[PDB]
């Protein structure tokens, strides 16, 4: 399928064990969708002070459209030195890895896989 339905575990950023997918923009993107893949991705909410306590590339979900079943529609876009890679709408927020961490919350989305 070109999309696929996630419910993405919420994790707070002082909780995150590991807290990016790597050292390349093509990286991060391809173990970001590994992950996702492989239910092994969390999602933090972006706020003041969240992004500076994560390791740069970061990878994003962005809403792609203006929401089936509760799954709002996302793509990937990376982040390096303030340049990004890709082009779509509002964060939902930055993706990490997955390792075990109590959410507070789901996130429904549909991936753009």
């Known amino acids: 399928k070109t999309h696929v339905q996630l ?4 994790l707070q ?3 995150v064990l590991v807290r990016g997918f790597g050292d390349s923009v093509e990286e991060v993107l391809s173990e970001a969708r590994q992950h996702l893949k492989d ?3 969390g999602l933090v909410e972006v706020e003041k002070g969240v992004l500076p306590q994560l390791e740069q590339p970061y990878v994003f979900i962005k809403r792609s459209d203006a929401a089936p079943h509760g799954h709002v529609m996302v793509e990937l876009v990376a982040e390096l030195e303030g340049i990004q890679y890709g082009r779509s709408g509002e964060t939902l927020g930055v ?8 959410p507070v919350a789901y996130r ?6």
């Open 7 to 10: 419910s993405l575990p919420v």
């Open 13 to 15: 950023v002082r909780d």
């Open 39 to 41: 239910g092994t991705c």
């Open 95 to 102: 993706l990490v890895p997955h390792v075990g961490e109590i």
């Open 108 to 113: 429904k989305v549909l991936l753009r896989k």
